[PDB]
Amino acid sequence: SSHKTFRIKRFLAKKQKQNRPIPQWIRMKTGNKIRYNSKRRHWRRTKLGL
Template sequence: MDQSPDLHAVGKRQLYSHLPTSNFIFPRPLTPPTCSFTMPSQKTFRTKRILAKASRQNRPIPQWFRLKTDTKIQYNAKRRHWRRTKLNI
């Protein structure tokens, strides 16, 4: 039979106790993650239309809408930051 230790019976801390602990289980990347797809300068009409719709949707709600009587919406929950959240197009 196989003599390897059972991972459920032995904790990770005991299993890797002989190794250095700094950044071993969750190593950090040396460079920030970059998008594998870069946007071409000559976009297709479909891509340009999707980008235009996304830029229209990415705005705060109007102030007069907050002042309405029966609304509970205070902000745009689907707001997107250009660097943090990508569109995946």
């Protein structure tokens, strides 16, 4: 928006750190069922919850 509130900026701060992939050693822990993040977002498709 470039004219943001503070609550709005925090919301984007959290959604922008959830985006990264899974650390590759996680795939090594004992009881795993996780391969790819599957909870990623891409600003062109699935716009934010706004």
